[PDB]
């Protein structure tokens with residue numbers, strides 16, 4: 001699979017390893033479910049990039065932790081800010097706006113995916129990125145500055161074009177659940 005090669009060649013090891021670990025604990029093989037693997041890597045990188053554009057410690061990363069730590073972080077945040085405990089593990093906590101964030105990344109229409117997220121959940125803030133430079137966030141509050149957002153959008157467009165370059169993008173486009 002070029003897709004497996006592409007993942008290894010275009011995302012930093014930490015992300016690949018985390019992605020690999022997450023699939024393999026739940027019986028899923030990244031050599032087979034390769035479009036899923038790419039997607040997880042993609043969502044992780046975004047989650048991390050979002051975090052990195054932050055009070056220097058603006059955001060707390062929840063995604064990418066093991067489940068024990070993820071919950072440990074979340075509870076610890078709830079107990080000392082008073083904020084209601086979410087049902088599902090979100091991606092980030094915003095210490096400035098003092099809310100949880102759910103990051104979405106979609107090959108579909110941003111509004112489409114936004115609804116799916118809003119429906120599945122809490123007073124968690126939602127931010128949706130697409131591979132087209134489009135984004136959607138609750139009450140249109142985009143949390144970050146334009147530069148930080150431009151960098152995420154550029155990284156996603158680039159992943160799309162690299163996939164496209166390797167005739168991998170049509171599979172990947174059509175593979176969102």
Ligand SMILES: O=C(O)c1cccc(-c2cc(=O)c(O)c(C(=O)O)[nH]2)c1
Nearest residue numbers: 043063089090091102103104105177
């Ligand atoms: O689109 C999906 O296949 C899907 C189904 C259930 C959950 C997720 C998902 C998307 C996410 O963006 C996410 O952050 C998580 C998480 O486990 O923290 N999970 C994605």
Ligand SMILES: [Mn+2]
Nearest residue numbers: 063089090091
């Ligand atoms: Mn998550």
Ligand SMILES: [Mn+2]
Nearest residue numbers: 091102103104
């Ligand atoms: Mn997410």
